[PDB]
Structure 1
Amino acid sequence: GSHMKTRADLFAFFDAHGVDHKTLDHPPVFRVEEGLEIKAAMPGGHTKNLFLKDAKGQLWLISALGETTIDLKKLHHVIGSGRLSFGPQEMMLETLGVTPGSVTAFGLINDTEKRVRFVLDKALADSDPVNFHPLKNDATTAVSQAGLRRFLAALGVEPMIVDFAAMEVVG
């Protein structure tokens, strides 16, 4: 809809659920910096966000670390069906209504319609942990594999693992 969540609700959201995650009030990037200094504490950050949608109409969020080269060609092949392909960003702005770049970070927050499934890459689920660039692009946010559990458990989302190398679900 025409309503996007805000930090006031986000910070309080994870604060009310006592999630194992904790947002960092770090400053933005003024000069050429990859967050190497903070990286020492956060093994994530330089992650990638994929935006795809199935033929059924549901969107799929596939997050992977910035170390491996995700194979979109082998992504859909993992299942064969679903017609998973690059979807129009407009779909993420209407459902997730977030900023361009990392909609999988806090896309579920805005997606209160129980839509859009959260898919974690075998490499991303390897404890990136899951640092992404949500609406709070101004600040950093890290959530351990144990954190998202309480995050999706509230929204009603079920995280799934898929190893592009194994061509199957890692459950």
Structure 2
Amino acid sequence: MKTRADLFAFFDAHGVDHKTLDHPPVFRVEEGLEIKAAMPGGHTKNLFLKDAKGQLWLISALGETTIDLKKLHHVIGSGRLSFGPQEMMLETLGVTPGSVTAFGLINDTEKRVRFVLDKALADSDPVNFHPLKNDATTAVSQAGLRRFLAALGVEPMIVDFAAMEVV
């Protein structure tokens, strides 16, 4: 299971530049606003899902993007979707509760996790995610995110969640 230092070593090897802000885990709306004020670009949510057929899925989206989980399976070609179990979140993404992040894909050595990217987040620059724990927020450019995914061999499925279409 990878550390933050391991993640940044991976970024460095592959030319993904980063800027990190350390902070207590956010439980207050004022603190969240302060972070967003210091860190431009897309601020994310990252949903760890398991479908009725056993396939794991990670959706990274802007926080405000509405995701209709009742109907999404028709769009992405999955079985009906539920939230995945915490144990698999640890095993495949190496993160603990409340710390889900696209950067956790560095831990998915069996390539069990299919990755869905909100079109609105693909069209954000920069983008911000936790560096494997929610006591920090890490910015990378949009190109950097794509460089990261490419280095892992992860092809994102880009979904327009408003139109409910793969794009």
TM-score (norm 1): 0.79
Which stretch of the first structure deviates more once superposed, 69-78 or 35-44? 35-44
**Cα drift, residue 11 of structure 1:** 1.8
Q: Tell me the C-alpha RMSD between the 2 structures.
A: 2.7
Q: Cα deviations across residues 28-72 of structure 1 (Å, max 9, x unaligned)?
A: 659763343342342357532212123453311112222233221
**Cα drift, residue 106 of structure 1:** 2.3
Q: Cα deviations across residues 90-149 of structure 1 (Å, max 9, x unaligned)?
A: 221222231112323322011122221221112222316431234242221112221122
Distance 1:80 1:113 in 2: 21
Detail structure 1 runs of 4+ shifted over 6 Å in the superposition. none
Tell me the SS of whatever aligns to 1:61: strand
Q: Does the aligned pair in 2 maintain the 1:62–1:120 contact within 8 Å?
A: yes
Tell me the SS of whatever aligns to 1:123: helix
Any gaps of 5 or more consecutive residues in structure 1?
none
- Select the residue among 150, 155, 158 that pairs with 1:158: 155
Q: Which residue of 2 aligns with 1:126?
A: 123
TM-score (norm 2): 0.81
Q: Does the aligned pair in 2 maintain the 1:65–1:128 contact within 8 Å?
A: no
Q: Which residue of 1 aligns with 2:15?
A: 18
Which stretch of the first structure deviates more once superposed, 141-150 or 20-29? 20-29
> How many pairs does the alignment contain?
167
Identity percentage of aligned residues: 100
Q: Which residue of 2 aligns with 1:105?
A: 102
- For residues 33-52 of structure 1, the aligned pairs below 5 Å read 33-43=30-40, 46-52=43-49
Distance 1:93 1:85 in 2: 17
Larger fraction in strand: 2
Any gaps of 5 or more consecutive residues in structure 2?
none
